[PDB]
Each structure stands twice: as C-alpha cells, then as structure tokens.
Amino acid sequence: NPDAACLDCHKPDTEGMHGKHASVINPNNKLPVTCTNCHGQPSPQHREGVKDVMRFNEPMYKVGEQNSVCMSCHLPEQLQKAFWPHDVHVTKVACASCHSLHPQQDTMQTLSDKGRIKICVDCHSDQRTNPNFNPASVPLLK
Numbered sequence: 442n443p444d445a446a447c448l449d450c451h452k453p454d455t456e457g458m459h460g461k462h463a464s465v466i467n468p469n470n471k472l473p474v475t476c477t478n479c480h481g482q483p484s485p486q487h488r489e490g491v492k493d494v495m496r497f498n499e500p501m502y503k504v505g506e507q508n509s510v511c512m513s514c515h516l517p518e519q520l521q522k523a524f525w526p527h528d529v530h531v532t533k534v535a536c537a538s539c540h541s542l543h544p545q546q547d548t549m550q551t552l553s554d555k556g557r558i559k560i561c562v563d564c565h566s567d568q569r570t571n572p573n574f575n576p577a578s579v580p581l582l583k
C-alpha cells in the first residue's frame with residue numbers, strides 16, 4: 442500500500458482519497474490510483490514547504506503546472522464531450538477551483554442545471570471586482 446507511507450503523517454479522512462478516484466483504475470498501469478499519481482513525491486525537505494509535491498488550488502504553482510498533472514490520465518477531447526467549458530479553462534484556471542476530489546462527493550457532479558451556470562457568474566464576477574484574484578487559487582466555490 443504505497444499510500445500508507447503518506448498516511449503515516451497525513452489524515453486518512455480529510456487527506457485520504459474518498460472521492461471517485463478511490464475506486465478507479467489508473468489507465469497508465471492498471472493499478473489503483475495512488476497519492477503520488479496526482480501529487481508526485483516528497484523530498485527530504487518536504488515538511489519545510491518546498492516545490493516537491495504538487496498542490497492544487499493553492500498559489501505555489503502556475504495554473505498550467507497544476508492542470509497538466511490531470512492530463513497524465515485524462516483526455517482533453519473527452520473532457521469537451523462531457524462539459525464544453527473545459528477547453529477554454531485548461532490553461533486559465535486551476536481544475537480544483539471547480540472540482541473537489543478528496544471528499545465523498547464532488548461539488549461539480551451534484552450541481553443543478555442552474556448551478557452549472559451560476560459558477561460562471563460567480564467566478565467571472567469575482568475577476569471583475571477582486572483585485573487579488575489569482576487563477577491558481579480560487580476559494581470562491583468552496
């Protein structure tokens with residue numbers, strides 16, 4: 442269990458993977474998805490706050506760096522078929538500004554029809570009125 446190493450320090454509930462990715466198979470190796478598949482690997486300096494592991498929806502990494510990890514498994518063509526606005530956001534805002542992957546359910550998969558339009562308004566309006574908007578880290582929808 443390669444996840445057990447992380448869970449020696451991290452909280453198995455809130456920092457455990459309890460969303461859909463807990464039950465999926467990694468298309469690259471046909472094994473269960475592990476922590477490092479999304480976060481990469483800690484260095485000896487990990488506890489100090491260094492650019493070792495990936496951090497999602499936080500200011501440390503550029504949008505392109507954050508989102509590229511998802512694309513080690515996901516396919517841009519298929520994302521379009523699921524939800525058109527994906528393409529224009531792939532390089533522009535953190536995937537995790539919308540998706541929540543650690544909890545038992547993802548906020549995006551439960552949105553009503555109205556909610557799927559309100560997210561556009563909420564974040565685009567924030568960009569117009571918030572001088573400190575940072576596309577790498579948006580707490581708005583959380």
Ligand code: HEC
Nearest residue numbers: 446447449450476477480482483487488489490494495496
């Ligand atoms: C203790 C020896 C740890 C082990 C083993 C792992 N993690 Fe860790 N992690 C630890 C600390 C004390 C911190 C805080 C560092 C800081 O920024 O001040 C972290 C941080 C993370 C994060 C970032 C969370 C955040 O605050 O934004 C992630 C995503 C993370 N750690 C992941 C992670 C993974 C994938 C691990 C196994 C490969 C792992 N950690 C092990 C402590 C320790």
Ligand code: HEC
Nearest residue numbers: 461465466467468474478479510511513514536537540550
């Ligand atoms: C492989 C190690 C993956 C990485 C890295 C990421 N995802 Fe993933 N995800 C993966 C699989 C095999 C599946 C099942 C569907 C499929 O494409 O085969 C998923 C599923 C999702 C979903 C949908 C969950 C649902 O409600 O059905 C979402 C929203 C999703 N994934 C998002 C996502 C994001 C934002 C990622 C980077 C932070 C990411 N995934 C990485 C495999 C893998």
Ligand code: HEC
Nearest residue numbers: 508511515523524526530531534535536539540549550557
């Ligand atoms: C809000 C504007 C979003 C951002 C930014 C990202 N995603 Fe998304 N995604 C969003 C919604 C509302 C949905 C549900 C679509 C539906 O009709 O139910 C999704 C879906 C996905 C999926 C699942 C697709 C499927 O086959 O069912 C995946 C794998 C996914 N999203 C991944 C993903 C990635 C990798 C993103 C950053 C590049 C990303 N999403 C951003 C809303 C939003």
Ligand code: HEC
Nearest residue numbers: 444447451456457458462475476479497537540541542543
């Ligand atoms: C993608 C499929 C992931 C896998 C597998 C793991 N993590 Fe993750 N992590 C991912 C995202 C998109 C986020 C942002 C929040 C969200 O739920 O969407 C995170 C967050 C973390 C954090 C920070 C938690 C916080 O500050 O609230 C930590 C410490 C963390 N992740 C660690 C971690 C561990 C130990 C994992 C294996 C059990 C693990 N992650 C898997 C994406 C994904």
Ligand code: HEC
Nearest residue numbers: 526529530533534538539557558560561562564565576579
């Ligand atoms: C942050 C949490 C966002 C949410 C939710 C949505 N959008 Fe967005 N969008 C966001 C950023 C940071 C940018 C880049 C702005 C820039 O100046 O480059 C965008 C961009 C768009 C675009 C641009 C298309 C283009 O001219 O190429 C469109 C058409 C767009 N966004 C639409 C859109 C929709 C329909 C959303 C709800 C599903 C939505 N956005 C949500 C940030 C965020």
